[PDB]
Amino acid sequence: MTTSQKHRDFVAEPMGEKPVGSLAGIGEVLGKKLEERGFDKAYVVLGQFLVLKKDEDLFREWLKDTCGANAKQSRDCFGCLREWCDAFL
Amino acid sequence: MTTSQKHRDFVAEPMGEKPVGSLAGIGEVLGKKLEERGFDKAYVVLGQFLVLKKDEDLFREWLKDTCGANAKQSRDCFGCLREWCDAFL
Amino acid sequence: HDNYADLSDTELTTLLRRYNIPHGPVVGSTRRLYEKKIFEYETQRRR
Known about the structure:
The complex is a heterotrimer, with 2 copies of chain A and 1 copy of chain C.
Chain A: H1 5-10, H2 28-36, H3 42-51, H4 56-67, H5 71-88
Chain C: H1 9-18, H2 28-46
Helix pairs in contact in C: 1-2
Protein name (chains A, B): Barrier-to-autointegration factor
Main location (chains A, B): nucleus
InterPro entries (chains A, B): BAF (IPR051387), BAF_prot (IPR004122), BAF_sf (IPR036617)
């Protein structure tokens, strides 16, 4: 899963108030759609993952249906948000 | 804010998969209503707080409108969930 | 299905803005709560 250094950097130190586009799998174009949806910060998006009880099918359908992310980009957010939770939750 | 030892214990160690009724301010009766609302775990409720951008007025209206918590019990959840985030987020 | 339920997330957000009503992310899980908030305000203007 050739994730960018952001995936390891994200699960290597707190998220603080970093921008949504900072989450692995979310690019600048996708971060803009979530931002227009009321998610101007990554911690708001991690909240959605927690509300879905880590349901991978509900999360991927939610992200894809919410912005149009591909099956591939959603996998990076699932493991990226989920691994952060494993070290942090 | 005479919060029970649960408030300090909650922000003193990870939350893990502890039951919703474990959050400070949420009693067994209130934990049952959130549970019927799809929040069988505390980490699902913390997610709601993250989705509301810590908006105290939206959070208190949501918890009160969702279960009927009093202005008093919602204050314990706000500072309790918010302080956990300060140490864990 | 509700009058306000036929509004799309983008249209719902612009409506809350017109009334200057604070809000967070709009999602079916909290969309209903938002539909009720606009109804209460719009009701006042109707009275």
